[PDB]
């Protein structure tokens, strides 16, 4: 779940990675 | 700089400054006065027979000075008016290469067209690079002996397979003497690599050795060694070291006529007793069982690259008895240590310095900035030595040359030499901290028993019990004093007297003040942990020695500092305060330290190695 | 002084932004569709289109009765009809701006060998051109990016020395005949 992992880890060291993964899920192809 | 003319002037001075300093050492070699242009030639690949090529470069005028086996001759072609000198050696032979490629001015390598080199030539190639290479030139022999298309590839299929040894150089081939005529010009106009060792001492090469003994029953007499002087001004009151047969004092020099001049008997110096320094190294006043050792040396070495000094604590004898001699340091670099607290009785047999660098700069200045009354270079001086045994004579009739060179003051006694080594990765065998190894420390040859140590700038140094392949280590041993710099080689007989090259490097400062320290790590285990307290099983066993090692600070394997607080067991348990909270995975361990001194196993005799081959 | 000419010219431009999705995607679709080798074969055909758009975009500022526009503009459309990219009824100077990369890539010799049926895939055309099996009117052509003109489209065939059209078999068939 990219939604939850972004909503949890947007503050941590892994913020850039979970934002990348969330845009991958939202935009999509 | 200021204004275009005082910038063009400012360039002209510094151009003149550099262009005149490069000329003040060019006349060190091969002038019209002519200390002869020594060219050592070796073939790498054993397919290349050396009498194939030397006949082709023989003819200006050829003078075959006969030797034991190899033809070591001199050449004069006065269409270019220079005096060449040709010596020749064989690949892999450590004896006949290393003794006259050390006084040589030029090395001429002969490569094969097919491959670069065989396996045995790569061996003596490694020792020559670490000994200090003179001016070197590649050469090849069988290029035009290949077809008219297959020779433009053969230089090109070779010259990249040389660069992992020889990064860039052109290759002058050898098929004709009109091919070799372009070699001697290329040989003549090089950039002269200056060997930093030899341009402070006065050395010589043997052209003809003559002998008559004083007495025959004692098998020792006096030599008539003849050859050119090639170093500095050879003083008469200095000592004389033959490179393979120890040090001694000569009694008479005399300059005969030059047997080989470029363009075509008087006694002058004698040795007194008042100036000649005395010869004393010390102060006068006071198969499967070794395989069973081999398989554990692939293992007891490997207890060092995963565990630093994990020893077993003594269960039988008390801890104040087994590790009585050691001590604990609060900080390994910033602790005080008296450098002369416990001198061994061997340190009453070595020589000291008041300040090594400032006594080096005063003995460096006198050979160059001061002119002594010795015989000047370029001459042909034969020499009468006092007392050398007869064994040095007939081996010259076998073919090896004998090299003798003068010594600086305070170069005959004993001290404690420190020398940087790097382990050569051509060998894979482990070496203990107190083995017997063949040392080649700056024109000397001796066996020794060193102490491997670490290369830091602080005063203390921790003993490395074995040899590693990547960290640069320092050997430490009693040896005669050689002033730095000096190139080092280290060998070891594997079997049949074959010398395995294991370590190369250079020389550090010779002094006994280098503190080499043997450690021992006492490992324990904490088994009841609390809030910032700890109960450590197994580190000690008695109750009383916990108060002995109480002031010695503790460390863990996870970086935690700590110290012993109290004991709580009548058995070997203890309470220890700490700074972080200990983890359940930890292993608390303490460090014990003591000084260590090397062994006195010095011997000037080295066995002559065999032709080095593979197995 | 020498009798040499140093007049050369690069035939491609690389993009301003190197890692851009949907530029990467579109050029990979054009590589796979037309059997090309690398990106530089798309950047080359993007470059000759950008030279043709730019020269027409210059000629569109001069008026309809300019000398230079009437001469040089009619000579630009003549080449684009000649190589078969434009048609004949679209020879105003404003159907140049409606050309694309795919119009220029359909005229290579590789895709025309595939279109005429002398191959059976777009990668089978690359080898059949490159192994010297394909000739144009008399001449063996060894280059896949040979832009086939409109009059040379009716003469593309199988190269009379080849095992496919001519008849003397290759290296492999004759050795198997030796082992028969």
């Amino acid at each position: 779940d990219p939604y939850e992992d972004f909503q949890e880890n947007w503050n941590t060291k892994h913020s850039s990675g979970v934002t990348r993964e969330l845009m991958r899920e939202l935009n999509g192809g | 700089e200021l204004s275009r003319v005082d910038q063009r002037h400012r360039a002209s001075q510094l151009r003149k400054q550099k262009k005149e300093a490069v000329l003040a050492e060019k006349r060190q070699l091969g002038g019209k006065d002519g200390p002869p242009h020594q060219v050592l030639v070796v073939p790498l690949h054993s397919r290349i027979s050396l009498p194939e090529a030397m006949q082709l470069l023989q003819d200006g005028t050829v003078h075959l000075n006969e030797l034991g086996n190899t033809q070591n001759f001199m050449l004069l072609c006065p269409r270019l008016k220079h005096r060449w000198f040709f010596t020749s050696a064989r690949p892999g032979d450590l004896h006949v290469v290393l003794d006259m490629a050390k006084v040589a001015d030029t090395i001429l390598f002969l490569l094969d067209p097919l491959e670069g080199w065989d396996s045995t030539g790569d061996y003596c190639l490694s020792c020559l690079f670490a000994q200090g290479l003179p001016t070197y030139t590649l050469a090849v022999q069988g290029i035009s002996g290949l077809p008219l298309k297959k020779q433009i590839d053969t230089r090109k299929k070779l010259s990249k397979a040389v660069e992992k040894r020889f990064p860039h150089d052109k290759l002058l081939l050898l098929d004709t003497q009109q091919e070799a005529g372009m070699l001697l010009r290329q040989l003549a106009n090089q950039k002269q690599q200056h060997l930093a060792f030899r341009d402070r001492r006065a050395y010589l090469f043997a052209h003809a050795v003559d002998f008559v003994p004083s007495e025959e029953n004692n098998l020792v007499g006096t030599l008539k060694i003849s050859g050119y002087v090639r170093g500095q001004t050879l003083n008469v009151n200095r000592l004389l070291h033959i490179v393979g047969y120890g040090d001694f004092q000569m009694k008479q020099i005399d300059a005969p006529g030059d047997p080989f001049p470029l363009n075509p008997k008087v006694l002058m110096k004698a040795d007194p007793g008042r100036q000649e320094s005395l010869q004393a190294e010390v102060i006068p006043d006071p198969d499967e069982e070794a395989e069973a050792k081999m398989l554990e040396k692939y293992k007891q070495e490997r207890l060092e690259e995963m565990f630093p000094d994990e020893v077993d604590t003594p269960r039988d004898v008390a801890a104040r008895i087994r590790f009585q001699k050691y001590r604990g340091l609060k900080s390994f670099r910033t602790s005080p240590w008296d450098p002369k607290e416990n001198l061994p009785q061997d340190y009453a047999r070595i020589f000291q310095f008041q300040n090594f660098t400032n006594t080096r700069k005063s003995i460096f200045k006198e050979v160059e900035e001061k002119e002594v009354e010795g015989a000047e270079v370029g001459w042909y001086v034969t020499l009468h030595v006092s007392e050398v045994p007869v064994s040095v004579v007939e081996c010259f009739r076998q073919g090896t040359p004998l090299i003798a060179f003068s010594l600086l003051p305070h170069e005959q006694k004993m001290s404690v030499l420190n020398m940087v080594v790097r382990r050569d990765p051509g060998n894979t065998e482990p070496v203990k901290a107190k083995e017997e190894l063949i040392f080649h420390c700056g024109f000397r040859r001796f066996r020794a028993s060193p102490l491997f140590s670490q290369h830091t700038a602080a005063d203390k140094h921790k003993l490395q019990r074995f040899l590693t392949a990547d960290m640069a280590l320092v050997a430490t041993v009693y040896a005669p004093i050689t002033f730095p710099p000096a190139s080092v080689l280290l060998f070891k007989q594997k079997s049949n007297g074959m010398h395995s090259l294991i370590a190369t490097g250079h020389l550090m400062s010779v002094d006994p003040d280098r503190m080499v320290i043997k450690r021992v790590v006492l490992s324990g285990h904490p088994f009841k942990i609390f809030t910032k307290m700890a109960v450590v099983r197994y580190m000690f066993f008695n109750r009383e020695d916990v108060l002995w090692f109480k002031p010695v600070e503790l460390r863990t394997k996870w970086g935690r500092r700590g110290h012993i607080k109290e004991p709580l067991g009548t058995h070997g348990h203890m309470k220890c305060s700490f700074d972080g909270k200990l983890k359940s995975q930890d292993t608390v361990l303490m460090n014990l330290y003591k000084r260590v001194f090397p062994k006195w196993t010095y011997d000037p005799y080295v066995p002559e190695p065999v032709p080095w081959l593979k197995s | 002084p020498v009798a040499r000419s140093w007049v050369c010219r690069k035939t491609y431009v690389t993009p301003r932004r190197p890692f851009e999705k949907s530029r990467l995607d579109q050029e990979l679709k054009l590589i796979g569709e037309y059997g090309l080798r690398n990106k530089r074969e798309v950047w080359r055909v993007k470059f000759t289109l950008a030279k043709i758009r730019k020269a027409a975009r210059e000629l569109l500022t001069l008026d309809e009765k300019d000398p230079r526009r009437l001469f040089e503009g009619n000579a630009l459309l003549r080449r684009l009809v000649r190589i078969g990219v434009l048609d004949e009824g679209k020879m105003k100077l404003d159907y140049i701006l409606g050309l694309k990369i795919e119009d220029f890539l359909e005229r290579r010799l590789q895709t025309q060998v595939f279109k005429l049926g002398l191959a059976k895939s777009i990668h089978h055309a690359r080898v059949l051109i490159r192994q010297r099996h394909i000739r144009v009117r008399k001449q063996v052509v060894n280059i896949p990016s040979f832009i086939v003109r409109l009059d040379s489209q009716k003469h593309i065939d199988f190269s009379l020395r080849s095992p496919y059209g001519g008849g003397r078999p290759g290296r492999v068939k004759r050795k198997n005949a030796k082992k028969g």
Binding site: - | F129, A130, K164, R165, P167, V420, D470, A472, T504, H506 | -
Partner: protein, 70 residues
């Protein structure tokens, strides 16, 4: 200590175990660090990095392609 004007320079030996290919008094080709005469972040006041030692490349020694010449 630079050859062509005598000036002195502290240069950074880049990868790991790359000081172990260098001894003293060795000849070293030095580059810039990449910021055109300014320091590169972590290191204070260091504007240069070693490229080649002993006329062989550090990337050739680190990756084990060649041997250190003595």
């Amino acid at each position: 200590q630079l050859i062509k004007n005598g000036k002195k320079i502290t240069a950074f030996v880049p990868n790991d175990g790359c000081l172990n290919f260098i001894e003293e008094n060795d000849e070293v080709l030095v580059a810039g660090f990449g910021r055109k005469g300014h320091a590169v972040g972590d290191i204070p006041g260091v504007r240069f990095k070693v490229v080649k030692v002993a006329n062989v490349s550090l990337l050739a020694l680190y990756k084990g392609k060649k041997e250190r010449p003595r």
